Design a protein around this ligand. Structure first.
Ligand SMILES: Nc1ncnc2c1ncn2[C@@H]1O[C@H](COP(=O)(O)OP(=O)(O)OP(O)(O)=S)[C@@H](O)[C@H]1O
Ligand SMILES: Nc1ncnc2c1ncn2[C@@H]1O[C@H](COP(=O)(O)OP(=O)(O)OP(O)(O)=S)[C@@H](O)[C@H]1O
Ligand SMILES: Nc1ncnc2c1ncn2[C@@H]1O[C@H](COP(=O)(O)OP(=O)(O)OP(O)(O)=S)[C@@H](O)[C@H]1O
Ligand SMILES: [Mg+2]
Ligand SMILES: [Mg+2]
Ligand SMILES: [Mg+2]
Lengths: 735, 250
């Protein structure tokens, strides 16, 4: 039917009165950016909005904020009709009232703090019956438009009168709160959130459709990841955005009950959910109820486990119910639960990446007034090893710091703290740097999986090797069809070998960056850390996380460290298992394995077998051209004098490794800083009785050159040159 | 708010009759090292003290001992008004009485042992109703100034007479014991104790803020370390210094 009908989608402009279409659709229904559009949703409600163009928006979809989304009584995936509305006229009076539960903690002049800057210069199209949201004074309050003089909808011009008559109204039964959790409250893990969204939309959102079809949906989705990553958060969001009934099972609470009551509460939970289908039963801290079969020693505890198992099987009802569960330790869960027909789907909600943490930070600073000096992206880059909860907490603590120092002044009369005072409250970048020092990040020891920021431009020379890496890794990803036509499947892995400090580690990260694929680094020593017993299970989890992160490059660095320890029964079991995991790794899975070693003489020939690390790429010391590129790359970030001759520098340093060059750069720079520090003191002495000299000069290099030493001896090189010729012969007898 | 208003902080000078300000603030209130200042706290109470300069003290704050802090019915972080007092006069007679629980173990001449050397060459500014503490004989007794002939406040000069009726008084309802635990009984780990003071001060001292702000405080503070490092000690001190209700789960 008609073109005006459109599908609801996530928002990009967090602004309430803004909806977005594609320019091809904005042309189709003949609307432009300024236009005010009228939206008709379900439950016979209307909302009016400013339309805009959005390059990301698919033409059959309409991006609307969750505020708009609620006013229509609509959710993601539903259909709404959009139509131009030039008939909108400026208001005389608008009468908005707050909702009690969103203000009962806060006092002051609601009209002057929130409505004022919200409508000022905003020209917001509003509608009678709409509920809009204003964030400020570290609080978010929602007002409902009770009346407009040009009803039902009017624009809010500066001329318009806006009144609030004191006492707030209660929430209507149908009016979902915006204080509630949503997808816009979760960041940095889109990919996982997508999979969860996929599995659950079809059965929950369209229940009759799935009962009629007779094909099986997922019923048990298991969320796992480190603590505080937002597992409990996600479950609530999915339930609210789909509008499904949400029944919470808090692990500890169930297991805190008597024997009989525990099994009972489980039964009641499932029964009530089947009753109010569609629903999500969420089991938080599952390992509390159902740990490994051995550790469950204590018989009543085993009864509860089986009880749960019967209830999960009890989804024979298939009343449109999904059971979600969260756990810190996937390994702790009774494997009986991860059986088919129960918790069959697993989502790794990992630690957030750099961009992710930034996103998180933005969500928990929404309501706070931040000073201009605050650069959350900087905070984001510094907060490595931080998890969602760490960030949410540090944001809270940075706020409480800003509160305390600003309450030193208010303390002269602590009785009257107002919202007006709260909006005046600014949060300095210092308040954040403060919270950083006070932060106790949990996930520093967690294995990180993200796309590296080392690019080709950080690596000097080896240009043709970069291209061979593009052949081996990038082409089979971006051009699978092409490999199919030639009838060849690509090699699984590569082995870097060469003298120390030539860029083997950089290359592994480099090719990853080019392919925009995830990266996993595993150093030799890291593998010898695992207890004798633990090692077997930990290796398997590594290859599993590589699958999760496909397309992914798995890099085993510093293999020399392991090779030493074997010729040692511990290190041996590890590698044999790594070998086994490679073979189990299907080539089709888009998981690429790279090895690196400074010791090609002792590497296990079994690794070099066809199908494993069969691509033997030798990485030698840099020649004269490369040495220039290396020195340039490292010193990009450094303020260098035009005096410095690097090509002359290159010839002098023949025999030096890539690392040996960064050695000279750092050594020369430390003199430059040494000079900068001793000069500030001299300037200090001169004032006691403005033109600093921050730039590195020729003698600094000439001094560093004077003390520079070589990491790779000549005898070592001559052997390395030989191994470049005979490495592939090691599968026979020892060369 | 007038400059006389100031915020209460930790003490550095262990002396009862001593308070400290920043000298830039001591200049503002036009006071010198010797001066005798009058302090007004909550419960419409007064205490009088000798002022000093302290470079570490922040200009908006006043360092006062827990003896002073108690006589004002005030706790750390609160506000008090300080004002010069030139009208301070030498005492004629002073009538101090011990508090029962602080003396019931020891007998003898309480006045010659405690009150005498405490006031000797002391020129202490004292006040009617104030409770001060004197330590000696491996015990600490609290005395309450019941009467001074120059009321309500007077200095204790060598000329001044000191009286005791022997009969001790019972503790009044609001009068906290100085036998109670405090930060002044804890040492060697201020840095940790600083963190603990911060986490807890805002949520505990200003509860009203947290209903309005809607931001989360800490809820669970876990102290750890080898046995006897003062974990239990810190917790009680925090409870007393903040005046919060304390429920123990051993
Ligand atoms: N990805 C995220 N985006 C936004 N906020 C997050 C994110 N992850 C965690 N948080 C915050 O962390 C806090 C705790 O979230 P939870 O869901 O309870 O953590 P969790 O994953 O359930 O960890 P548990 O309790 O050990 S199972 C919430 O207040 C969130 O705001
Ligand atoms: N081609 C290069 N371009 C720029 N810097 C390099 C290059 N090669 C080595 N380096 C420097 O040497 C450091 C480490 O190089 P790696 O990538 O680890 O090479 P490697 O073969 O793994 O040798 P090691 O034993 O791990 S240092 C880097 O941090 C660089 O600063
Ligand atoms: N830092 C300190 N300052 C003053 N007194 C201390 C300090 N540390 C320990 N003490 C004394 O040592 C005693 C023990 O104090 P506690 O706080 O109970 O130790 P603890 O941390 O509870 O150790 P436990 O009983 O093994 S948990 C008290 O009598 C204190 O007076
Ligand atoms: Mg939780
Ligand atoms: Mg390396
Ligand atoms: Mg103890």
């Amino acid at each position: 039917n008609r073109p005006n009908r459109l599908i609801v989608d996530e928002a990009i402009n967090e602004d309430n009165s803004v909806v977005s279409l594609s320019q091809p659709k904005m042309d189709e229904l003949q609307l432009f950016r300024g236009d005010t559009v009228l939206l008709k949703g379900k439950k016979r409600r209307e909302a009016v909005c400013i339309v805009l163009s959005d390059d990301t928006c698919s033409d059959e979809k309409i991006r609307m904020n969750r505020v708009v989304r609620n006013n229509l009584r609509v959710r993601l995936g539903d259909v709404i009709s959009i139509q131009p509305c030039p008939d909108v006229k400026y208001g005389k009076r608008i009468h908005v009232l707050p909702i009690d539960d969103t203000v009962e903690g806060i006092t002051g002049n609601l009209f002057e703090v929130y409505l004022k800057p919200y409508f000022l210069e905003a020209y917001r199209p509003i509608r009678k019956g709409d509920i809009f949201l204003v964030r400020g004074g570290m609080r978010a309050v929602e007002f409902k438009v009770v009346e407009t003089d040009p009803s039902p909808y009017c624009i809010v011009a500066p001329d318009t009168v806006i009144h609030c008559e004191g006492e707030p109204i209660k929430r209507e039964d149908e009016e979902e709160s915006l204080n509630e959790v949503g997808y816009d409250d979760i960041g940095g893990c889109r990919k996982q959130l997508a999979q969860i969204k996929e599995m659950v939309e079809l059965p929950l959102r369209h229940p009759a459709l799935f009962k009629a079809i007779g094909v099986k949906p997922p019923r048990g989705i298991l969320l796992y990841g480190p603590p505080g990553t937002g597992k409990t958060l996600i479950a609530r969001a999915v339930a609210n955005e789909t509008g499904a009934f949400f029944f919470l099972i808090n692990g500890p609470e169930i297991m805190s009950k008597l024997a009989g009551e525990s099994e009972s509460n489980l039964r009641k939970a499932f029964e009530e959910a089947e009753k109010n289908a569609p629903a999500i039963i969420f089991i938080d801290e599952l390992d509390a109820i159902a740990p490994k079969r051995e550790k469950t020693h204590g018989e009543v505890e085993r009864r509860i486990v089986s009880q749960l198992l019967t209830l999960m099987d009890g989804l024979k009802q298939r009343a449109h119910v999904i059971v979600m569960a969260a756990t810190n330790r996937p390994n702790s869960i009774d494997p009986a639960l991860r059986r088919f027909g129960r918790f069959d789907r697993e989502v790794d909600i990992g630690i957030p990446d750099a961009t992710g943490r930034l996103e998180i930070l933005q969500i928990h600073t929404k309501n706070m007034k931040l000073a201009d000096d605050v650069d959350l992206e900087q905070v984001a880059n510094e907060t490595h090893g931080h998890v969602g909860a760490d960030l949410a907490a540090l944001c809270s603590e940075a706020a409480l710091q800003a509160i305390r120092k600003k309450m030193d002044l208010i303390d002269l009369e602590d009785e009257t703290i107002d919202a007006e005072v709260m909006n005046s409250l600014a949060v300095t970048m210092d308040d954040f740097r403060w919270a950083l020092s006070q932060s106790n990040p949990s996930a520093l020891r967690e294995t990180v999986v993200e796309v590296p920021q080392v690019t080709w431009e950080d690596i000097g020379g080896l240009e043709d090797v970069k291209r061979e890496l593009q052949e081996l890794v990038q082409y089979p990803v971006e051009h699978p069809d092409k490999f199919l036509k030639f009838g060849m499947t690509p090699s699984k892995g590569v082995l870097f070998y060469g003298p120390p400090g030539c860029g083997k580690t950089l290359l592994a990260k480099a090719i990853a960056n080019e392919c925009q694929a995830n990266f996993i680094s595993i150093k030799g020593p890291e593998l010898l850390t695992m207890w004798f017993g633990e090692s077997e299970a930990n290796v398997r989890e590594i290859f599993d996380k590589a699958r999760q992160a496909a397309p992914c490059v798995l890099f085993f660095d510093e293999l020399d460290s392991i090779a030493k320890a074997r010729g040692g029964g511990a290190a041996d079991r590890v590698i044999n298992q790594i070998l086994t995991e490679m073979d189990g790794m299907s080539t089709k899975k888009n998981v690429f394995i790279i090895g690196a070693t400074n010791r090609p003489d002792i590497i296990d020939p079994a690794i070099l077998r066809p199908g494993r690390l069969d691509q033997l790429i030798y990485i030698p010391l840099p020649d004269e051209k490369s040495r220039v590129a290396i020195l340039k790359a490292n010193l990009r970030k450094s303020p260098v004098a035009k005096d410095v001759d690097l090509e002359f520098l290159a010839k002098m340093t023949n025999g030096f490794s890539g690392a040996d060059l960064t050695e000279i750069c750092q050594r020369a720079c430390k003199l430059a800083i040494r000079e900068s520090i001793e000069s500030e003191i001299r300037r200090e002495r001169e004032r006691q009785t403005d033109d600093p000299v921050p730039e590195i000069r020729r003698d600094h290099f000439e001094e560093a050159m004077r003390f520079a030493r070589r990491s790779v001896s000549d005898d070592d090189i001559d052997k390395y040159e030989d191994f470049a010729d005979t490495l592939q012969q090691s599968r026979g007898f020892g060369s």
